[PDB]
Amino acid sequence: GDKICLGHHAVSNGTKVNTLTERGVEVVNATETVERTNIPRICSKGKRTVDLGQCGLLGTITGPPQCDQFLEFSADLIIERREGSDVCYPGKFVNEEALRQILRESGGIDKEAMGFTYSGIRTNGATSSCRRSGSSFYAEMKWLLSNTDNAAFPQMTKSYKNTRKNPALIVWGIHHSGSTAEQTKLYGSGNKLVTVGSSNYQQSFVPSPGARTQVNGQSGRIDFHWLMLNPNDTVTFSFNGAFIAPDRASFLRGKSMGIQSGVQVDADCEGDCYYSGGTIISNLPFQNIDSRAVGKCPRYVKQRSLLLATGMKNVP
């Protein structure tokens, strides 16, 4: 007699997937859910991009030679590199990583002079470590010496209001001379205070001179400190030596994203989730490439692969 059968398709090569109940049940078709594929370039299309290279990010505020291009840089995507250095004369920032975190989402920096001027001291402190056309210094900073060797250093106060609408990034420095013999040659005898007060901020600094490991010919050190000066607020610097004074305040431009990387930029390909190995273009909800990846990203998971079935059971 005549019959009609009901059926469903199938194939020879089913893809194996996992279910609540079974490991490795075959289905007709399945798609990958975990991204493994990475582009080994920073996909920068659509975005102003500053590749700091030699220049440390914190260096853009203080202005060692490496960072002269960038003293007023403007960007959407900021790329720091492993070779990048924030200094010429050995030293570090206090609270460095916070400040980095700020500058990375800052849009870039716009500089303004704080208008200090000086009587009865020298202003042209320089060193063979920060060299441009030979011995020089941090661009945005003034190395205040005493007026002549061993000479006394006039106790001074200097101030700066932030008349703008946004806060002002203020930076200054302490000089830790390689011996007491050096501390005096530069700022004279006596012990030395540097006192910084806004209204919402007070703190103090004593120079610790002494032998240290020689770094780029230098045995001395610059501690760099900072603060956010508030609209209409004033910062005041009371000091009698060992003070690396700011010339210019910095202001944040807008919004940006910073990343750390070891691959080329590419302005042709567009992207939005970056990591050190490159950029991750993908619509998959998860990725297994790098847990520290940043931007707008797939959630990082432990697993190479989680296949999601997009077809029925295979029964062949």
Binding site: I4, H8, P285, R292, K302, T310, G311
Partner: protein, 167 residues
């Protein structure tokens, strides 16, 4: 000889997910069913829209490859992150597993819904052979086969004939 879905699938069914294999005097044939195939595709495409979202939330660096942060806070960060990594790995695994179980059962349910639909239009003029076919107890030419598929088959037209042949 010919079999249905209860035995197995049809490696020959190329232009659809679900279908009909008929056997009559004129010969043997396979056509796909569009609406039941589409319904199962739409349902699956609906999952993909849900699961192929890109997160709108943005995350920034907290950490540093080049210059490692203080140990204590770095360890807290590293710990916080790992706990979060554990959570998403669990979620991702369960989601795929849950969704896959459902994707299977969804499609079985669509085969089911088609077969029990046919059985109902065929009324008292056919019997379940148990492999997923119906032995039709009358002559059903290529036209009558096409009237079952496109859901136009009127059972009362063949009733008295078929009823009698089952006795």
């Amino acid at each position: 000889a010919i079999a249905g879905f209860i035995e197995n699938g049809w490696e020959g069914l190329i232009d659809g997910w679900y279908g009909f294999r008929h056997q009559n005097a004129q010969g043997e044939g396979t056509a796909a069913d569009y609406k039941s195939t589409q319904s199962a595709i739409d349902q699956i495409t609906g999952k993909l829209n849900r699961l192929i979202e890109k997160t709108n939330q943005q995350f920034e660096l907290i950490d540093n490859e080049f210059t490692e942060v203080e140990k204590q806070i770095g360890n807290v960060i590293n710990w916080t992150r790992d706990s979060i990594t554990e959570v998403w790995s669990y979620n991702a695994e369960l989601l795929v597993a849950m969704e896959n179980q459902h994707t299977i059962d969804l499609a079985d349910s669509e085969m089911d819904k088609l077969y029990e639909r046919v059985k109902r239009q065929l009324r008292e003029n056919a019997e379940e052979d148990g492999t997923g076919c119906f032995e039709i107890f009358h002559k059903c030419d290529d036209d009558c086969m096409a009237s079952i598929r496109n859901n136009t088959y009127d059972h009362s037209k063949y009733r008295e004939e078929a009823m009698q042949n089952r006795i």
